[PDB]
């Protein structure tokens, strides 16, 4: 019952925290700093947002690796924002 | 790199398929049959949708266990539709 | 590094505790009570020992489900004692 | 039933193969080449043997990183040989 489900949830939570720790980048989205991971490591730059303190939007300017981008579209990747970014 | 990430993805995919197999219910949402799991097993009926062949919406009538419901709101649960259903 | 390895270890530890919780049986081996799981659920009765407080041996009498057995041979199953038991 | 158990087994199998891939070393034990991982990454050199084609023994000479060692003792680490090696 819950046991199995509660276990699975914790494993998923720890699994994502590890991916973010290993490949995450520090990035600024609409004024808020957060961690993102390039889609290269998981699969017009593409990245999925791991921090839970931001809600990215189409329009938002994203500073990544010193360059400015614009979130042109937003998909889902296991419930996480997958952003399509375009140079400015 | 990808190895770890590709592994994690497969584990997540298999983990959800098992939860659906063990606790999933067969239910009809807006004319389409699909599998859903009561939130009781994972945490005004509440359920998360596991089948990938439906896109639930506020308004949709849901036949569950012989009764009709209406999806009043839709949240996310690890990227899956979590529906709040009300009796008719 | 350790992170990934430490994570994997904990998942394995929790994974086994769940299997034991769901299918484990209470059994007496050479005077000590412990949990065992029938090989039917994992693959001349055959079982693997989950409790860490016993060290089974060829010769040992095992009371299981009301009947007495003798451990005729001992293999390994992911590092756990897999006992071959014969009726008395 | 088996489903959960069969899933857990596969995850464990894939989990170990990944650790070996990331930290494994190529080493010769009693004439046979195999993969080993330093205990530093998992916890008088100490290592656990991942390859399934060897059966290490006390006495065996082990060539590791260009140096010769002797397996002085053998423990278990989740069912895998954990060897204690001494310089020659």
Domain positions in chain B are: 1-24, 26-88
Task: Give the Cα separation of A77 and A37 in Å (integer).
Answer: 12
Among partner residues B2, B77, B78, which is closest to A41 by beta-carbon distance?
B2
Search chain B and give the residue with CA nearest A2: B41
| Number of alpha helices (DSSP H) and beta strands (DSSP E) in chain B | 1, 6
Q: Strand D25-29 to strand D32-38: parallel, antiparallel, or no bridges (unpaired)?
A: antiparallel
- Judge: domain D26-88, CATH 3.30.230.10: no
- The closest alpha carbon to B64, from B79, B44, B78, belongs to B44
Give the pairing of strands B32-38 and C46-49.
unpaired
Spatial separation of the C-alpha atoms in residues C48 and C32, rounded to whole Å: 15
Which of B32, B29, B33, B41 has its CA nearest to residue B83?
Answer: B29
Q: Please indicate whether, in this complex, the C-beta atoms of C15 and A7 are within 8 angstroms of each other.
A: yes
Pick the closest to residue D81 from A5, D42, A68 (CA basis). Answer: D42
Q: How far is B79 from chain A (nearest CA, A)?
A: 3
Q: Are A22 and C33 in contact (CB under 8 A)?
A: no
Contacting residues of D for C43, CB less than 8 Å apart: 2
Residue of A nearest to C21 (CA): A3
Are B18 and D4 in contact (CB < 8 Å)? Answer: yes
CATH architecture designation of domain D1-24: Up-down Bundle (1.20)
Helices and strands per DSSP (H, E), number in chain D: 1, 6
Among A65, A50, A62, CA closest to A86: A62
User: Tokens standing for B81?
Assistant: 């539709």
- C50 φ, ψ (degrees, to nearest 5): -95, -35
Residues from chain B that touch A16, judged by Cβ atoms under 8 A, are 8
Considering only the beta carbons, identify the residue of C7, C21, C22 that sits closest to A14: C7
């Amino acid at each position: 019952s819950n046991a199995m489900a509660d276990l699975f949830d914790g494993m998923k939570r720890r699994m994502d925290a590890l991916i973010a720790e290993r490949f995450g980048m520090k990035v600024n989205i609409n004024g808020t700093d957060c961690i993102v991971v390039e889609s290269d490591f998981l699969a017009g730059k593409n990245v999925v947002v791991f921090s839970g303190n931001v809600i990215p939007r189409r329009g938002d300017r994203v500073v990544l690796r010193g360059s400015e981008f614009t979130v042109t579209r937003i998909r889902r990747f296991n419930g996480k924002p997958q952003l399509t970014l375009e140079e400015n």
